[PDB]
Amino acid sequence: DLTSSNFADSADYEILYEIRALYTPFLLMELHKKLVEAAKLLKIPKFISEALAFTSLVANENDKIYLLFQSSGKLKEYLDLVARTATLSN
Amino acid sequence: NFININNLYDDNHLDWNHVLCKVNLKEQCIQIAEFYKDLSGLVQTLQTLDQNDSTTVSLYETFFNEFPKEFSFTLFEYLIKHKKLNDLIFRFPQQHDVLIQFFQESAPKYGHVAWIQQILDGSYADAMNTLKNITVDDSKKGESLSECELHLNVAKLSSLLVEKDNLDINTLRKIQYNLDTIDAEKNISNKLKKGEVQICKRFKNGSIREVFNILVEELKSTTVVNLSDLVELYSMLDDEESLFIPLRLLSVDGNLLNFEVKKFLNALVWRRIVLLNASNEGDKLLQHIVKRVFDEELPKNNDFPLPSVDLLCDKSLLTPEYISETYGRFPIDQNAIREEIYEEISQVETLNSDNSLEIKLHSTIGSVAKEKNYTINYETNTV
């Protein structure tokens, strides 16, 4: 639900909440798997920002991918691959 | 006792001589890699030039995170200042520093001086809930106008769709409460450029119109408000587009009042108005503004005396210690306001003879009683 002028239903909202939750961070996460299993770190295999540049590119209020995203459950899965993007320049 | 100034030179030129052991040739730099129980400067500037997640397998740190008086001084000195983000000294998070600060905040060292992950990282739950401690440091102010707007629109839009459960709606509330004090100055800056303020021809004289005139001159241009000065210019304010706006402040910001100071503010404003109503006949001036006190239902949302004879006939309510600092925050003379307030009191009592000013409060509440229950009181000064 994005507005409250149109028709919405609450029974039918919790199965937006959770169905969103199941898959939207996966698509996010497979962008971040390409960093360390396709080795494309920016738009060239050099420089490691675009994992460090993504740490508040995941954070947006224009797509609102922030508010559903777990502070330990999805954020810990996310930073461990950043930490493997960092060791391509360690 | 020149201790502090000696050991200034000492740690300065250990940190300098620990980036000078880095532009020298090396073999015995192992004797910094290994080599402490006290006196820092072995990991304070010996990896604090690059990422600290690429050096968690290095000798500098994660070997000094078990040595005491080394462990605790790295993560202390990095969380002193990172705050304000709309400045040339940090600028905004997006790169390198953001991912270090992540580490140091959910930690045995603590926030309320940094919140960089609590605006933008991913987290909503740990972020905006710990952010609640920080949005009482935006209680009636912004830091920058453009920075406050950034914290709050992120906290608003984050909290629009609650998905850390959906029941956790507290996180919307004080965030909205703080967006108003930046919105206010935007609106009012253009409005005094047009201008609409008007001034009384009775109290034009005195140092009592100077609380009013300052606020006007400040608000031509974008300026964060003070609230109590508005209650205190009341009776010196003219026009009927505004003559009833600090009745709002008694209610909703009467919460920021201490519930003892609020009484003597009320004693000041209704003692000014009773004299002002001696130059109005009909008592119509009082009648309209006591209507607005009854149609917002002021005395029944908080304690509030309605104008009546006792609240302006006693000189035991006059408190000089209060006046010397609520008008001692502007460059007017402290005696000048205090002797003016004094002579208001002795003019109430010189015309409580033949019931002159007495009947004029009696008949104001007493005629707005033909359609409401509010009627004159004086056994507590409240209905």
Swiss-Prot record, chain A:
The record's disulfide annotation reads none
Q: Which residues cross the membrane?
A: none
* Source superkingdom: Eukaryota
The cellular location(s) given in this protein's UniProt record come to: Nucleus, Nuclear pore complex; Nucleus membrane
> What does UniProt give as the signal peptide span?
none
Its annotated function is as follows:
Functions as a component of the nuclear pore complex (NPC). NPC components, collectively referred to as nucleoporins (NUPs), can play the role of both NPC structural components and of docking or interaction partners for transiently associated nuclear transport factors. NUP84 is involved in nuclear poly(A)+ RNA export, in NPC assembly and distribution, as well as in nuclear envelope organization.
- Record-stated family: Belongs to the Nup84/Nup107 nucleoporin family.
Miscellaneous information on this protein: Present with 8580 molecules/cell in log phase SD medium.
Give the quaternary structure: Component of the nuclear pore complex (NPC). NPC constitutes the exclusive means of nucleocytoplasmic transport. NPCs allow the passive diffusion of ions and small molecules and the active, nuclear transport receptor-mediated bidirectional transport of macromolecules such as proteins, RNAs, ribonucleoparticles (RNPs), and ribosomal subunits across the nuclear envelope. Due to its 8-fold rotational symmetry, all subunits are present with 8 copies or multiples thereof.
What is this protein's name? Nucleoporin NUP84
Gene designation: NUP84
| Residue window of the full protein shown | 637 to 726 of 726
Curated annotation (Swiss-Prot), chain B:
Compartment(s) of residence: Nucleus, Nuclear pore complex; Nucleus membrane
TM annotation in the entry: none
Taxonomy, superkingdom = Eukaryota
Similarity annotation? Belongs to the nucleoporin Nup133 family.
Oligomeric form and interacting partners: Component of the nuclear pore complex (NPC). NPC constitutes the exclusive means of nucleocytoplasmic transport. NPCs allow the passive diffusion of ions and small molecules and the active, nuclear transport receptor-mediated bidirectional transport of macromolecules such as proteins, RNAs, ribonucleoparticles (RNPs), and ribosomal subunits across the nuclear envelope. Due to its 8-fold rotational symmetry, all subunits are present with 8 copies or multiples thereof.
In the record's own words, the domains note is: Usually mRNA binding pumilio repeats come in 8 copies. In the 8-fold symmetry of the NPC the 8 repeats may be provided by eight copies of NUP133.
The record describes the protein's role as: Functions as a component of the nuclear pore complex (NPC). NPC components, collectively referred to as nucleoporins (NUPs), can play the role of both NPC structural components and of docking or interaction partners for transiently associated nuclear transport factors. NUP133 is involved in nuclear poly(A)+ RNA, tRNA and pre-ribosome export, in GSP1 nuclear import, in NPC assembly and distribution, as well as in nuclear envelope organization.
Query: What else does the entry mention about this protein?
Result: Present with 3060 molecules/cell in log phase SD medium.
Record's protein name: Nucleoporin NUP133
Q: What stretch of the parent protein is included here?
A: 773 to 1155 of 1157
